């Protein structure tokens, strides 16, 4: 029991292409999304690992 739970939720993802249709169908256990994340600004960014804060 992690976090007081013996059950799990296993998430997976995808990049939905422009003008393509995604299809969800399930007879149970589907944690469906309500949102999708459109890519509004592509650009060379990064993820920095720090414990600090932005000044």
């Amino acid at each position: 029991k992690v976090n007081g739970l013996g059950s799990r939720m296993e998430f997976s993802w995808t990049l939905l292409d422009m003008w393509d249709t995604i299809n969800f169908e399930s007879t149970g256990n589907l944690i469906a999304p309500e949102y999708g994340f459109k890519i509004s600004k592509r650009g060379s960014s990064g993820i920095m690992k720090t414990e600090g804060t932005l000044e």
Binding site: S44, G46, I47
Partner: protein, 171 residues
């Protein structure tokens, strides 16, 4: 050091010579005078700046390591990444440092060569109207004005003017 002017036959520097890197000191009647050469010091400035600009212009590529994260099931991949980053790192360290060491040598040698070349310019200009003492100074066999002096420092010296005069005072 390699051309043996600096810390060589010209044993030490001139703390009063501060209008340039190299130059003259004439001690006639009219006065004394630490007075920097123009041509040689300029050319030496142009060379060096050209050099360091050619050093900062050589290690300027990009961009990021893009920084990647790996599973507890892809530890060869993670290490391959690591091995290739450290790898390049070491290469660019060596390259930067060796370049530094080498261009430092060549720089000091360049000043040395510069000075010697100057002293050789003056010596072969004067010829035998003087005593090559070998402290890097010359002793005249005639009277040299703030006018004959300031004619040597700009490349113009009528040898056969003072030829007979100096031949006389020599003997």
């Amino acid at each position: 050091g390699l051309f043996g002017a600096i810390a060589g036959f010209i044993e030490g520097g001139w703390q009063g010579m501060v209008d340039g890197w190299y130059g003259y000191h004439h001690s006639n009647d009219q006065g004394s005078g630490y007075a920097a050469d123009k041509e040689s010091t300029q050319k030496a400035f142009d060379g060096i700046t050209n050099k360091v600009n050619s050093v900062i212009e050589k290690m300027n590529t990009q961009f990021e390591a893009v920084g990647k994260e790996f599973s507890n099931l892809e530890r060869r991949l993670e290490n391959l990444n690591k091995k290739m980053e450290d790898g390049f790192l070491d290469v660019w360290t060596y390259n930067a440092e060796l370049l530094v060491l080498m261009e430092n040598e060549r720089t000091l040698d360049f000043h040395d060569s510069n000075v010697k070349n100057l002293y050789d310019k003056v010596r072969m200009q004067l010829r035998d109207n003087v005593k090559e003492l070998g402290n890097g100074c010359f002793e005249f066999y005639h009277k040299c004005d703030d006018e004959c002096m300031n004619s040597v420092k700009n490349g113009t010296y009528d040898y056969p003017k003072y030829e007979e005069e100096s031949k006389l005072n020599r003997n």
